[PDB]
């Protein structure tokens, strides 16, 4: 039938880096593996070397997914290549990923990059290969697409290899976890929950064995070798705001659109309290980021107005601001000059948001996207905000920092408005869901599972 992959003590060096030293690749046919590990450690390189067959791989049909070309070809046609059944399947996969009939029959040239990535995703799902490899497939999808993709991949019967830092996705889809650590692959049977249990237990026991080793060495001296394990203590805690008299923040009769385009919102009324937990949902391109920018005041309404308490302090996150910052300063200098922080305070703040010590003295322009995002979260902490407004906060974070962010949101005594595709984050923070639709915002009275069933019921899909 189908062969397994067992490549033992292979090594991969790429871009002048020793990414894999004597690693073992075990991929059993039919199982679903999630590949997790820190940024820049060689996950994408491993997938590319498997697809290339640069590593000795048996002749199984293997597909690695990447962005699809832009031409006059209609989207279901780039999927497609009896025929009625195949076209219906392609259109079902496309609708699940957020394609309405028009977008379906739309030429692939009139789509942005992310939508072309979705088109390619539909392709590899349609082809149904023996071994399908997905590189962070939910990272740039919206919540509706992630809901559908999770539900779809649970019924997948062939072999999957998925790189991801989407914890709920990994928990719902994967039967095995592969951890890229110390240039090697470590295997865990079960989803991410099982992996984190086993890994934290391994680290506790390594610490105890190191301590007993050093105690016995001291005893020998008074009368191969192990190293001390490494800590990784992220704490995303935000300071709790003092009491604030209403009104807090609201849009009143707000109409907004961009020049020469049909307005994205008409006669919009939407307000928050100091305990609000709001998750803005809707397919990409509907205006979620625009709504957040209207809530911050960085976009001015065409009609109506935004009103907030004149003492309200907003902490705002989005990826484009992370590329803004103050590029020639170090993160330490950035925090100290922005908020008159003593050096030790800036250091502890940068450290607890996940910025390693060696990066505190690098110019911000030389930092990676994840490092810049962590600097922005630290800045938000220093701003002492009353309202957190987070547009896709998890895109450049690891799972441990996303868990820390969820815990911090649950401890935070201010308001939080978030746009996110991370189901675990949206769920654990008890977010009330508000969908952008009808040039307005509509409340989903119900929990996240109600919205998930609603999304799948609109598509004629059976929730597993
Ligand atoms: N085109 C390139 N040129 C130079 N260096 C690269 C290139 N691609 C990757 N690298 C380096 O190789 C290392 C591993 O890259 P890779 O992208 O495989 O890691 P990854 O973060 O696990 O992958 P991904 O984030 O794409 O899932 C990183 O240090 C990265 O900077
Ligand atoms: N500066 C701009 N000028 C003209 N049109 C814009 C501009 N910014 C966004 N748009 C358009 O407005 C529509 C909605 O944009 P927006 O990014 O707010 O929605 P979104 O995809 O839900 O948010 P996100 O960017 O967080 O995914 C899109 O069709 C987009 O092309």
Curated annotation (Swiss-Prot):
Effect of residue 392 to Q: Does not inhibit ribosome binding. Reduces protein synthesis
Residue ranges constituting the ABC transporter domain according to the UniProt record: 5-207, 249-464
Effect of residue 68 to E: Does not inhibit ribosome binding
Binding, ATP 1: 37-44
GO molecular function: ATP binding; ATP hydrolysis activity; ribosome binding; RNA binding; translation activator activity; translation factor activity, RNA binding
Keywords: Activator, ATP-binding, Cytoplasm, Nucleotide-binding, Nucleus, Phosphoprotein, Repeat
Superkingdom classification of source: Eukaryota
Keyword Calcium: no
Record flagged with keyword ATP-binding: yes
GO term, biological process aspect, one: translation
Outcome of mutating residue 136 to Q: Does not inhibit ribosome binding. Reduces protein synthesis
Entry's Gene Ontology cellular component terms: cytoplasm; cytosol; membrane; nuclear envelope; nucleoplasm
Tissue expression summary: Ubiquitous.
Impact after mutating residue 421 to L: Does not inhibit ribosome binding
Reported modifications of this chain: Isoform 2 is phosphorylated at phosphoserine and phosphothreonine.
Chain sites annotated for binding ATP 2: 282-289
Signals that turn on the gene: By TNF in cultured synoviocytes.
Outcome, altering residue 43 to M: Does not inhibit ribosome binding. Reduces ATP-binding. Inhibits ATP-binding and reduces protein synthesis. Shows an enhanced association with polyribosomes. Does not inhibit IRES-mediated protein synthesis
Family: Belongs to the ABC transporter superfamily. ABCF family. EF3 subfamily.
Self-association state and partner proteins as the record states: Isoform 2 interacts (via N-terminus) with EIF2S1; the interaction is independent of its phosphorylated status. Isoform 2 associates (via both ABC transporter domains) with the ribosomes.
Function as written in the Swiss-Prot or TrEMBL entry: Isoform 2 is required for efficient Cap- and IRES-mediated mRNA translation initiation. Isoform 2 is not involved in the ribosome biogenesis.
Protein name: ATP-binding cassette sub-family F member 1
Source organism of this protein record: Homo sapiens (Human)
């Amino acid at each position: 039938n189908a062969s397994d992959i067992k490549l033992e003590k292979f090594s991969i060096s790429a871009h002048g880096k020793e990414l894999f030293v004597n690693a073992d690749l075990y991929i059993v046919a039919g199982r679903r593996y999630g590949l997790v590990g820190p940024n820049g450690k060689g996950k994408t390189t491993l997938l590319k070397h498997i697809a290339n067959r640069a590593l000795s791989i048996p002749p199984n049909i293997d597909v690695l997914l990447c962005e699809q070309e832009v031409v006059a070809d209609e989207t279901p046609a780039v999927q497609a290549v009896g025929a009625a059944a195949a076209e219906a399947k392609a259109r079902r996969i496309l609708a699940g990923l957020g394609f309405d009939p028009e977008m379906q029959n739309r030429p692939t040239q009139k789509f942005s990059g992310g939508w072309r990535m979705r088109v390619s995703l539909a392709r590899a799902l349609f082809m149904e290969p023996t071994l399908l490899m997905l590189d962070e497939p939910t990272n740039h999808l919206d919540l509706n697409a992630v809901i559908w993709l999770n539900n779809y991949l649970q019924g997948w019967r062939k072999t999957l290899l998925i790189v991801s830092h989407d914890q709920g996705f990994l928990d719902d889809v994967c039967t095995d976890i592969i951890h890229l650590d110390a240039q090697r692959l470590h295997y865990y049977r079960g989803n991410y929950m099982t992996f984190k249990k086993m890994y934290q237990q391994k680290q506790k026991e390594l610490l105890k064995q190191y301590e007993k080793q050093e105690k016995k060495l001291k005893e020998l001296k008074a009368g191969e070798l192990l190293k001390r394990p490494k800590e990784y203590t992220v704490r995303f805690t935000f300071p709790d705001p003092p009491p604030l008299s209403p009104p807090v923040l609201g849009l009143h009769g707000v109409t907004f659109g961009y020049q020469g385009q049909k307005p994205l919102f008409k006669n919009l009324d939407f307000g928050i309290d100091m305990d609000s937990r709001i998750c803005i949902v809707g397919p990409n391109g509907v205006g979620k980021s625009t709504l957040l920018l209207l809530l911050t005041g960085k976009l001015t309404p065409t009609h109506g107005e935004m009103r907030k308490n004149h003492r309200l302090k907003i902490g705002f996150f989005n990826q484009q601001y992370a590329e803004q910052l103050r590029m020639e300063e170090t993160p330490t200098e950035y925090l100290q000059r922005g908020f008159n922080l003593p050096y030790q305070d800036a250091r502890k703040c940068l450290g607890r948001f996940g910025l390693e010590s060696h990066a505190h003295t690098i110019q911000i322009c030389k930092l990676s996207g994840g490092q810049k995002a962590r600097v922005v979260f630290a800045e938000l902490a220093c701003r002492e905000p009353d309202v957190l407004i987070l547009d896709e906060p998890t895109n450049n974070l690891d799972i441990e920092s996303i868990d820390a962010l969820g815990e911090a949101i649950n401890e935070y005594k201010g308001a939080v408005i978030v746009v996110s595709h991370d189901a675990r984050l949206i769920t654990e923070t008890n977010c009330q869901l508000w969908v952008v639709e009808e040039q307005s915002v509509s409340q989903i009275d119900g929990d996240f599972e109600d919205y998930k069933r609603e999304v799948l019921e609109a598509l004629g899909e059976v929730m597993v």
